[PDB]
Design an enzyme around this catalytic site. Structure first.
Site, PDB file in Angstrom:
ATOM      1  N   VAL A  61       0.857  -1.138  -0.064  1.00 21.17           N
ATOM      2  CA  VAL A  61      -0.033  -0.007  -0.038  1.00 21.17           C
ATOM      3  C   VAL A  61       1.026   1.245  -0.117  1.00 21.17           C
ATOM      4  O   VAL A  61       1.623   1.460   0.940  1.00 21.17           O
ATOM      5  CB  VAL A  61      -0.939  -0.056   1.263  1.00 21.17           C
ATOM      6  N   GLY A  62       0.824   2.078  -1.079  1.00 21.04           N
ATOM      7  CA  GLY A  62       1.598   3.254  -1.297  1.00 21.04           C
ATOM      8  C   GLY A  62       0.847   4.369  -0.928  1.00 21.04           C
ATOM      9  O   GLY A  62      -0.410   4.162  -0.680  1.00 21.04           O
ATOM     10  N   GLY A  64       2.067   8.125  -0.952  1.00 20.46           N
ATOM     11  CA  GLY A  64       2.561   9.610  -1.651  1.00 20.46           C
ATOM     12  C   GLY A  64       1.778   9.865  -3.075  1.00 20.46           C
ATOM     13  O   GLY A  64       1.097   9.023  -3.587  1.00 20.46           O
ATOM     14  N   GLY A  67       2.959   7.022  -5.008  1.00 23.20           N
ATOM     15  CA  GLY A  67       2.903   5.660  -4.301  1.00 23.20           C
ATOM     16  C   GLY A  67       4.206   5.209  -3.898  1.00 23.20           C
ATOM     17  O   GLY A  67       4.541   3.863  -3.914  1.00 23.20           O
ATOM     18  N   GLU A  68       4.843   6.045  -3.207  1.00 25.08           N
ATOM     19  CA  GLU A  68       6.418   5.797  -2.772  1.00 25.08           C
ATOM     20  C   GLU A  68       6.340   5.900  -1.212  1.00 25.08           C
ATOM     21  O   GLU A  68       7.652   5.769  -0.648  1.00 25.08           O
ATOM     22  CB  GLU A  68       7.289   6.752  -3.367  1.00 25.08           C
ATOM     23  N   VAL A  69       5.518   5.982  -0.421  1.00 25.05           N
ATOM     24  CA  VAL A  69       5.476   6.063   0.919  1.00 25.05           C
ATOM     25  C   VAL A  69       4.932   4.623   1.341  1.00 25.05           C
ATOM     26  O   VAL A  69       3.730   4.373   0.923  1.00 25.05           O
ATOM     27  CB  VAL A  69       4.641   7.269   1.619  1.00 25.05           C
ATOM     28  N   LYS A  84       9.696   6.443   3.020  1.00 19.90           N
ATOM     29  CA  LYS A  84       9.682   6.921   1.648  1.00 19.90           C
ATOM     30  C   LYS A  84      10.881   6.770   0.769  1.00 19.90           C
ATOM     31  O   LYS A  84      11.945   6.872   1.244  1.00 19.90           O
ATOM     32  CB  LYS A  84       9.419   8.597   1.830  1.00 19.90           C
ATOM     33  N   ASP A 170       7.160  22.908  -0.593  1.00 21.78           N
ATOM     34  CA  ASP A 170       5.902  22.359  -0.961  1.00 21.78           C
ATOM     35  C   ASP A 170       5.036  22.162  -0.002  1.00 21.78           C
ATOM     36  O   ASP A 170       4.621  21.110   0.378  1.00 21.78           O
ATOM     37  CB  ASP A 170       6.317  20.994  -1.854  1.00 21.78           C
TER      38      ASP A 170
HETATM   39  C1  LIG Z   1      -0.980   7.339   7.450  1.00 19.90           C
HETATM   40  N1  LIG Z   1       0.222   8.161   7.106  1.00 19.90           N
HETATM   41  C2  LIG Z   1       0.833   7.833   5.870  1.00 19.90           C
HETATM   42  O1  LIG Z   1       0.569   7.357   4.833  1.00 19.90           O
HETATM   43  C3  LIG Z   1       1.979   8.903   5.890  1.00 19.90           C
HETATM   44  C4  LIG Z   1       3.418   9.187   6.538  1.00 19.90           C
HETATM   45  C5  LIG Z   1       3.569   8.732   7.706  1.00 19.90           C
HETATM   46  N2  LIG Z   1       4.605   9.061   8.332  1.00 19.90           N
HETATM   47  O2  LIG Z   1       2.765   8.021   8.336  1.00 19.90           O
HETATM   48  N3  LIG Z   1       4.017  10.048   5.599  1.00 19.90           N
HETATM   49  C6  LIG Z   1       3.573  10.361   4.542  1.00 19.90           C
HETATM   50  N4  LIG Z   1       2.296   9.771   4.535  1.00 19.90           N
HETATM   51  C7  LIG Z   1       1.123  10.104   3.365  1.00 19.90           C
HETATM   52  C8  LIG Z   1       1.207  11.423   2.899  1.00 19.90           C
HETATM   53  C9  LIG Z   1       2.136  11.230   1.965  1.00 19.90           C
HETATM   54  C10 LIG Z   1       1.950   9.726   2.175  1.00 19.90           C
HETATM   55  C11 LIG Z   1       3.685  11.515   2.263  1.00 19.90           C
HETATM   56  C12 LIG Z   1       4.676  12.081   1.312  1.00 19.90           C
HETATM   57  C13 LIG Z   1       5.800  12.512   1.792  1.00 19.90           C
HETATM   58  F1  LIG Z   1       6.819  12.890   0.656  1.00 19.90           F
HETATM   59  C14 LIG Z   1       6.318  12.216   2.806  1.00 19.90           C
HETATM   60  C15 LIG Z   1       7.751  12.468   3.652  1.00 19.90           C
HETATM   61  C16 LIG Z   1       8.774  12.649   4.066  1.00 19.90           C
HETATM   62  C17 LIG Z   1      10.029  13.002   4.462  1.00 19.90           C
HETATM   63  C18 LIG Z   1      10.631  11.660   4.581  1.00 19.90           C
HETATM   64  O3  LIG Z   1      10.721  13.853   3.588  1.00 19.90           O
HETATM   65  C19 LIG Z   1       9.944  13.519   5.874  1.00 19.90           C
HETATM   66  C20 LIG Z   1      10.971  14.415   6.259  1.00 19.90           C
HETATM   67  C21 LIG Z   1      10.682  14.734   7.690  1.00 19.90           C
HETATM   68  C22 LIG Z   1      11.236  15.683   8.536  1.00 19.90           C
HETATM   69  O4  LIG Z   1       9.638  13.837   8.066  1.00 19.90           O
HETATM   70  N5  LIG Z   1       9.216  13.242   6.793  1.00 19.90           N
HETATM   71  C23 LIG Z   1       5.504  11.367   4.019  1.00 19.90           C
HETATM   72  C24 LIG Z   1       4.206  10.979   3.540  1.00 19.90           C
END
Ligand SMILES: CNC(=O)c1c(C(N)=O)nc2n1[C@H]1C[C@H](C1)c1cc(F)c(C#C[C@@](C)(O)c3cc(C)on3)cc1-2
Length: 322
Positions: A61-62, A64, A67-69, A84, A170
């Site tokens: 399950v991606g 971002g 779809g990289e997270v 990520k 961003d």
């Molecule tokens: C239920 N949550 C998620 O699916 C989740 C999480 C998470 N941490 O649970 N992160 C992300 N997502 C969703 C929102 C989308 C996918 C999304 C996109 C991203 F580029 C990132 C990121 C990042 C970092 C690695 O550059 C970062 C640097 C520092 C400090 O902190 N982060 C996270 C997430």
């Protein structure tokens, strides 16, 4: 002097360490090397390899834009968190230099980064409420009190980043992560970040076009004020349920961003006067006249008080967008 020597000790293995080491190593990223910052992500005999020492959760399950997270478990400790994935060939050093060493409730904690072949894997805390970007899609748009409440935290983290001369690059709903109950919001993704002293030089990946400040588009010089423009495009998205500009204009959006007046036409008319005035101050086309992070957080905290504090249920009832 010893600097160059410490980098060499870090290359070629994966170790437990600290943010300053991770950034030292990260600068070299332009086989399996990296630094882990937390006791629950542990290497085994100099290695941390995907599917050996950490597994992605279940069928993949991606989450971002690409779809990289992913959710992941450390095989030995049982700990869970988020990866990520970043292509090593496009990796911006600032994605880790600009955030290693940080500590702030409004900013998602970093757990480490490990290179493994063509992948830079970046690990962080898993926040169970998902992204504000999802919240908006789920609920259509947000009540004004909730939208202000999150916007204030976003500005709270931008305050932290800005007085350390860091520009997030961003700001947008997809990069705010909510806790499990919806009460805490934190900024993630520094892949567009930039340390401070035009944006269109170097390893530069541009941010989301709809949330793009007018100086960013016209080439003009850029400071922390571009985050503030973005946060207010994010605000409109939270309120309307859609990005600014996408309604009124079809063609290459960045052309309208530079010629047109700031999209304050899209401010909902049922917003209390201080909501609307604050959105306007963070949407001034000239960064000099645009509010800073600290000004707009104060201004928004009061706008939240004016509508009676935060009262809406976090997952209340759906609301039809614009
Ligand atoms: C239920 N949550 C998620 O699916 C989740 C999480 C998470 N941490 O649970 N992160 C992300 N997502 C969703 C929102 C989308 C996918 C999304 C996109 C991203 F580029 C990132 C990121 C990042 C970092 C690695 O550059 C970062 C640097 C520092 C400090 O902190 N982060 C996270 C997430």
């Amino acid at each position: 002097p010893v600097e160059e020597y410490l980098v060499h000790a870090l290359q070629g293995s994966v170790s437990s360490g600290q943010a300053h080491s991770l950034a030292s190593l990260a600068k070299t990223w332009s086989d399996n090397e990296g630094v882990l910052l937390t006791e629950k992500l542990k290497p085994v005999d100099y290695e941390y390899r995907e599917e050996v020492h950490w597994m992605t959760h279940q069928p993949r399950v991606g989450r971002g834009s690409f779809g990289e997270v992913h959710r992941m478990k450390d095989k030995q400790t049982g700990f869970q968190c988020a990866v990520k994935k970043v292509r090593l060939e496009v990796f911006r050093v600032e994605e880790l230099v600009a955030c290693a060493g940080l500590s702030s409730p409004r900013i998602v904690p970093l757990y480490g980064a490990v290179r493994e072949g063509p992948w830079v894997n970046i690990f962080m805390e898993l926040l169970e409420g998902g992204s504000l970007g999802q919240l908006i899609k789920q609920m259509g748009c947000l009540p004004e009190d909730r939208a202000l409440y999150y916007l204030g935290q976003a500005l709270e983290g931008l305050e932290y980043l800005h007085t350390r001369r860091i520009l997030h690059g961003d700001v947008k709903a997809d990069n705010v992560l909510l806790s499990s109950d919806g009460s805490r919001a934190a900024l993630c993704d520094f892949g567009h970040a930039l340390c401070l002293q035009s944006l269109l030089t170097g390893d530069y990946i541009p941010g989301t076009e709809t949330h793009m400040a007018p100086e960013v588009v016209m080439g003009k010089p850029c400071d922390a004020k571009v985050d503030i423009w973005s946060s207010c495009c994010m605000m409109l998205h939270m309120l309307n349920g859609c990005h600014p500009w996408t309604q009124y204009f079809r063609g290459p959006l960045c052309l309208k961003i530079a010629s047109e007046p700031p999209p304050i036409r899209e401010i909902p008319p049922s917003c209390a006067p201080l909501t609307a005035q604050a959105i306007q101050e963070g949407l001034r086309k000239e960064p000099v006249h645009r509010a800073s992070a600290m000004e707009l957080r104060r201004k928004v905290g009061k706008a939240l008080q004016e509508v009676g504090g935060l009262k809406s249920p976090w997952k209340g009832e759906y609301k039809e967008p614009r």
